[PDB]
Design a protein around this ligand. Structure first.
Ligand SMILES: COc1cncc(-c2cc(F)cc(CNC(=O)c3cc(N4CC[C@@](C#N)(C5CC5)C4=O)cc(C)n3)c2)c1
Ligand SMILES: COc1cncc(-c2cc(F)cc(CNC(=O)c3cc(N4CC[C@@](C#N)(C5CC5)C4=O)cc(C)n3)c2)c1
Ligand code: PRO
Ligand code: PRO
Ligand SMILES: [Ca+2]
Ligand SMILES: [Ca+2]
Ligand SMILES: [Ca+2]
Ligand SMILES: [Ca+2]
Ligand SMILES: [Cl-]
Ligand SMILES: [Cl-]
Ligand SMILES: [Cl-]
Ligand SMILES: [Cl-]
Ligand SMILES: [Cl-]
Ligand SMILES: [Cl-]
Ligand SMILES: [Zn+2]
Ligand SMILES: [Zn+2]
Lengths: 493, 487
């Protein structure tokens, strides 16, 4: 059984849950983790939903090399200056030096965009809308944490190039909403949509959009997905130019977006919904939504496992994902425990009394509530229960966010509420340095709550729909500049 | 259209087809290639079929790290010695030199098997059947060739551990059959199942089963998929051990297999079926099976007639969708009909569906088969049926053509002179073989590019007459072995 407790040692509870649920195995190279089938299946459920959605938008899947030349890596100065200290460099094969060191992709702008420059020669050659599912490497020497901050991670990155800013601007928001659907409709996690501040925005892009999620267990917020408008900052460096019908002789730079989402998702799903029995899966991504365990003679034993398989096939035929744990090797209760740790939404108990009274027992994982269900009603009732679990999870999580995201209009209120464990929308002047000073003084003036994290606030996002509307001539919390917008600040992952 | 001929310079033809069908772009780093969506789609078709099949076998997908440590990498000494000259090494991040060089996976035995040791505590913990779709790197400095021989490629690698040799041996043949089905039912390419000679087997394994394919245009064979019985060679090194259920205290080492399939498939599909018109897609993997091109839309035609025309194309598109034919309707304004014929012929779309104004007014259409070029006029009401029939018939005939190729280019020979210029005939030869490595090196050296072993076929063309001597003459033949020139 799981014995670590979430409300105490969050990090050890995280370790124990992600290992005992068999989602994650440790590797002998720090910051790289083994994604076992139980986690990978969640990634695939995401993969399937998102791939369908971007296909409806004209995006096509492809695969670009993992290595980058130095010369191409340094064409956009802002971008490479941001990523350079964390780029893994391959320098030899065997004992033989390469001709020239090659970089492993931290992100694939500099891999893809020379190809885009090749493929664009006329207005009719745009848009280009490419996506790939691949790994990238970002070799930070800070302490890694499974799913959340790792040095190799699986992700998808989409890269689109348009002839007009309007097309591009349209796609940035479409994609961001899709990410919000991934979080809220699949992982049952509510998120805040907004723009990044100048400080936090993607180096080399015009503006970045983001969804933020709140982990109430640590009081911290984490960026769940991101979608950037790069504008013409990359096309002018890689010469992605077309020559217009309307505009003779004048080279036109493509307008570009890139957008990304990673297995960080799974980590967030653990931190929000997980409890002290283990993992809790939302039904829409759970590898197995219903697990059938036989409970409690010889003819009776064979007929019992046949009834379990009856339920298995019945559920299979209604697109409920289902496993029959029919091993002679472990108790009923050990299976209860194993599948509770793995977070299966419904446990299906079938014992001979229930088997001959034509019924069964359904145990919900989120609440623990046990129901007796008539055999006849399985396909119906379990579907309903599955549906109700998903809603329940989302509802609980949303009630958390709403109670932890409040407004403060002065620095002192912001400080007190932020040390209270919440994330705060404050009037903000926008300037990078203001954000630095915010970070510095919220760390300096922090009144430490028991077990609370000791760090400064960062900006999370500028919400599209702020809680309040910035009253006219409001100063920023810095006092000295007029506020430009309400910004969501908090302590971050 | 396309200019280079396949029968002349095969390599120039090949580069032209793979770029002009928008499958492959070149990267500024030699040996790595961009799989554009036309190619990636084929890979995803192969993925869907194989993923489903190995799911049925009990294999689950995972993802293991791309980096392996120096210590773990050399634990099985044979395998590491085979791959070391071509392992890429990461030595720094930014400017800071790493404390230890870390390696990029060339294959993943030495990433996964320490975890397998962690996960096999008891006999109940077996079998372990994991597979992953990922990229690997084999930084060889020989001349690359897209799809076939590349420094980085996508593949699947399945790694499985069992408590007995019997279920391991079972799975090896099962996976080899799946690979044969990918080649023959999906890509419409016939292959030859066999075992690698002692020389050509996976280093650190006990035996390697393989499917070999034949590119007739160069006279060369190539290994299309492989499936190894690693035996106990890796479990004795990474200590993957379980206690015998019946003998208390005695530990047993797991028996393991690994099997792999790469994007080389697409390259083979290009070499066997491609022609001087361009790429040729087997309907079963074709991203697009039918393309609907409206013709006749000159400016003289009425807006009434133009909108009726494209509406009729949309009718066809939805009706083929209604029967699970993968149809694109290319209704674009800016490109000409001839430009579209060429575009989609180069990409090798199996059927082109031309609907012009007159055709519409006679409730009929023109279907053009990519492979042979026949134009069939077809009544409107029979679309869904007839198009289905043609798609089937394309796949069949592609396979049939290739198969006859194979059967004429694979012949028996019992002596090395016949072997020698049957081989310089542009063919592959089955010869009686002693199996010894000295003699394999000898056959390579004599046959000069010299000939290499390909496989010891499950089903040889002829049975060995007893006392048959190997072609060395010095020793007696152990088995008919398929030899030839190789990719
Ligand atoms: C504040 O500094 C840190 C503090 N503590 C630890 C680290 C750290 C430690 C490591 F050992 C390795 C790393 C490198 N990995 C990552 O930076 C990272 C970023 C993301 N990100 C970033 C935003 C994004 C979204 N949405 C973008 C789409 C991409 C998304 O998912 C996802 C993952 C799995 N990993 C960082 C860094
Ligand atoms: C006589 O030798 C050579 C001749 N000419 C060129 C090279 C060479 C040149 C390079 F620039 C890079 C490389 C490295 N890549 C590969 O070796 C390779 C092997 C396979 N393989 C090997 C067998 C297999 C099957 N079926 C196994 C499943 C795995 C399968 O698909 C597939 C791919 C795409 N790449 C080799 C080597
Ligand atoms: O790393 C990023 O944030 C962007 C989005 C995906 C690719 N590059
Ligand atoms: O590369 C090979 O040949 C084996 C089988 C696939 C993974 N490793
Ligand atoms: Ca950085
Ligand atoms: Ca206090
Ligand atoms: Ca100022
Ligand atoms: Ca070698
Ligand atoms: Cl525990
Ligand atoms: Cl090199
Ligand atoms: Cl919003
Ligand atoms: Cl639901
Ligand atoms: Cl809660
Ligand atoms: Cl290091
Ligand atoms: Zn300010
Ligand atoms: Zn011999």
């Amino acid at each position: 059984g799981l014995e670590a407790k979430k409300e105490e040692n969050l990090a050890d509870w995280y370790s124990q849950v992600i290992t005992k649920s068999e989602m994650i195995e440790y590797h002998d190279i720090s910051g790289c983790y083994i994604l076992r089938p139980w986690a990978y299946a969640i990634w695939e459920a995401i993969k399937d939903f998102f791939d369908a959605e971007i296909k409806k938008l004209g995006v096509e899947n492809c695969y670009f090399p993992m290595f980058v030349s130095q010369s191409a890596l340094e064409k956009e100065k802002t971008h490479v200056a941001d990523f350079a200290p964390e780029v893994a460099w391959v320098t030899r094969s065997g004992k033989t030096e390469l001709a020239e060191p090659i970089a492993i992709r931290p992100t694939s702008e500099t891999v893809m965009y020379p190809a885009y420059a090749k493929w664009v020669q006329s207005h009719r050659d745009l848009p280009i809308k490419l996506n790939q599912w691949c790994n990238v490497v970002r070799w930070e020497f800070k302490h890694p944490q499974p799913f959340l901050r790792t040095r190799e991670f699986l992700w998808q990155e989409g890269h689109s190039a348009f002839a007009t800013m309007e097309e591009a601007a349209e796609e940035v928001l479409q994609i961001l909403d899709l990410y919000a659907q991934v979080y809220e409709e699949l992982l049952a996690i509510p998120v805040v949509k907004g723009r990044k501040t100048e400080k936090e925005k993607f180096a080399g892009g015009d503006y970045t959009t983001t969804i933020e999620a709140f982990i109430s267990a640590s009081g911290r917020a984490i960026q769940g997905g991101t979608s950037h408008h790069l504008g013409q900052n990359f096309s002018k460096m890689f010469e992605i130019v077309f020559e217009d019908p309307k505009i003779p002789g004048e080279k036109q730079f493509a307008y570009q977006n890139s957008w990304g989402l990673t297995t960080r998702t799974i980590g967030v799903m653990t931190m929000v919904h997980g409890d002290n029995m283990g993992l809790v899966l939302p039904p829409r991504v759970a590898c197995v939504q219903v697990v059938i365990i036989p409970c409690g003679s010889e003819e009776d034993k064979e007929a019992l496992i046949a009834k379990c398989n009856d339920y298995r096939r019945r559920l299979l035929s209604v697109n409920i994902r289902v496993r029959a744990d029919l091993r002679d090797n472990y108790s009923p209760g050990w299976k209860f425990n194993h599948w509770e740790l793995k977070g299966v939404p419904i446990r299906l108990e079938v014992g001979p009394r229930d088997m001959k009274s034509c019924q069964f027992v359904a145990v919900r994982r989120d609440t623990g509530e046990k129901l007796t269900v008539a055999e006849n009603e399985a396909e119906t009732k379990l579907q309903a229960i599955l549906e109700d679990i998903q809603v329940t999870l989302f509802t609980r999580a949303s009630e958390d966010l709403k109670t932890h995201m409040v407004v403060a209009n002065t620095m002192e209120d912001f400080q007190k509420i932020l040390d209270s464990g919440k994330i705060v929308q404050i009037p903000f002047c926008g300037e990078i340095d203001c954000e630095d000073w915010i970070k510095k003084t919220t760390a300096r003036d922090q009144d430490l709550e028991p077990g609370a994290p000791s760090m400064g606030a960062k900006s999370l996002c500028i919400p599209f729909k702020p809680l309040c509307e910035l009253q006219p001539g409001a100063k920023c919390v810095c006092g000295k500049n007029p506020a430009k917008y309400y910004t969501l600040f908090g302590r971050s992952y």
